[PDB]
Design a protein around this ligand. Structure first.
Ligand SMILES: O=c1c(O)c(-c2ccc(O)c(O)c2)oc2cc(O)cc(O)c12
Length: 402
């Protein structure tokens, strides 16, 4: 009654983390999965390997194809700039043969009932899925507003093939909920999916280095009032530059509000202690869920959009690349549930007035937050039982057996 799924995550945070958050839901619903990864991408699957026994959860590690345009020993896009994705595509394209090989050396009672790979790797995964007559289901961590804008592009490339392949797969899973953007879910379903199969599953919630995760919780607890502090983070993988940061550090100081800000390193005077600074990894989910945070200053990634939404925080947009502008269009303009605080991928706001209206989001009852809360109620209803996404998780597992 339960399927065997072969998942193929795309090696970058934005794709990788929700992709695995999805494989948890597949397994929670009784499936057994095999995750194909590359040697240094194995750490990702550590937590998932713990929560599920070796009978139901299996790992297929293949050596990363060597590439002249990737520096040696790099296997994910955390490290390269975003413009270097097209070589990560060709590199992993070469993973095709070993997968084909591995699957052929298999008894047909071990061959999976469906492949759940990233849509970015659909071009060759779809070629595998056909050869072995397995259903290819694609995964994207972006909302359907972005997909509808992207697929409708006339010049799509170098993204064209993955968009065509995604359009030709069995169906497509995305990390959104239906009531948020039904117009665009149906756009994609009718206009860009040959078999009109689309599963909305979000918000894919996650399951459970410079400053420990516990000492930061004591810090936050040491702050009433509730929603006092602003969390400022652009994380993996968009990095800043030294002139831009001094504009932000200046904007942060003039505001006189408590903050946290995860990343000389810059600025040179850390010493004004209403806000804390974390080098490297930070426990974002726990920070944002915490009562004391009321605002997120984010590049407006979709994963951050849903994190911030679930965490019930004021969303301050500074879109820079990838889908950030599609999200800005949807969430700030079309939905008036955020507020745009930086213009451009290389914008600088004048620190002084940026400090002004960021502090005005320590009010914090700006009607942006009230708009986003009603959005969150609908997202929560979406994932709890009977909701669009929940029911979609069920039908997706159900359909892989077919
Ligand atoms: O929509 C996306 C997009 O346009 C690009 C992109 C943008 C500018 C470039 O110069 C480039 O090479 C790629 O990347 C992405 C990477 C993701 O993980 C998700 C996305 O949705 C996009």
């Amino acid at each position: 009654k339960k399927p065997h799924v072969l998942v193929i995550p795309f090696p970058q945070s934005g794709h990788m983390v929700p992709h695995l958050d999805l494989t948890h839901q597949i397994l929670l619903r009784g499936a057994t999965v095999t995750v194909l990864v590359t040697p240094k991408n194995s750490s990702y699957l550590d937590a998932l390997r713990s929560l599920h026994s070796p009978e139901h959860f299996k790992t297929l590690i293949l050596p990363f194809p060597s590439h002249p345009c990737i520096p040696s020993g790099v296997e994910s896009l955390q490290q390269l700039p975003l413009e270097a994705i097209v070589h990560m595509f060709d590199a992993l394209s070469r993973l095709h043969d070993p997968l084909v090989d591995f699957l052929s050396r298999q008894p047909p009672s071990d061959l999976p009932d469906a492949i759940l790979g990233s849509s970015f790797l659909s071009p060759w995964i779809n070629k595998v899925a056909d050869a072995f007559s397995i259903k290819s289901i694609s995964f994207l961590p972006i909302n359907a507003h972005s997909i509808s804008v992207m697929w409708a592009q006339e010049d799509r490339s170098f993204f064209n093939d993955l968009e065509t392949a995604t359009t030709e797969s069995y169906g497509l899973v995305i990390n959104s909920f239906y009531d948020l953007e039904p117009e665009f879910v149906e756009t994609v379903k009718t206009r860009f999916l040959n078999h009109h199969r689309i599963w909305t599953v979000g918000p894919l919630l996650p399951f459970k280095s410079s400053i420990p995760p516990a000492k930061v919780s004591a810090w936050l607890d040491s702050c009433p009032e509730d929603n006092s502090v602003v969390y400022v983070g652009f994380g993996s993988q968009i990095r800043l530059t030294a002139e831009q940061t001094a504009a932000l550090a200046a904007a942060l100081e003039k505001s006189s509000v408590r903050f946290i800000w995860a990343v000389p390193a810059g600025f040179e005077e850390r010493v004004k202690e209403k806000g804390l600074v974390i080098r490297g990894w930070a426990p974002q989910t726990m920070i944002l869920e915490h009562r004391a945070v009321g605002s997120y200053l984010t590049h407006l990634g979709w994963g951050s959009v849903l994190e911030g939404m679930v965490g019930g925080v004021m969303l301050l947009a500074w879109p820079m690349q990838a889908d950030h502008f599609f999200n800005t269009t949807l969430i700030v303009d079309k939905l008036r549930a955020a507020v745009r605080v930086g213009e451009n991928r290389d914008s600088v706001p004048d620190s002084d007035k940026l400090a002004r209206i960021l502090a005005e989001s320590a009010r914090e009852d700006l009607p942006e937050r009230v708009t986003l809360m009603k959005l969150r109620e609908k997202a929560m209803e979406a994932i709890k039982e009977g909701g669009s996404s929940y029911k979609n998780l069920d039908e997706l597992v159900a359909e892989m057996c077919l």
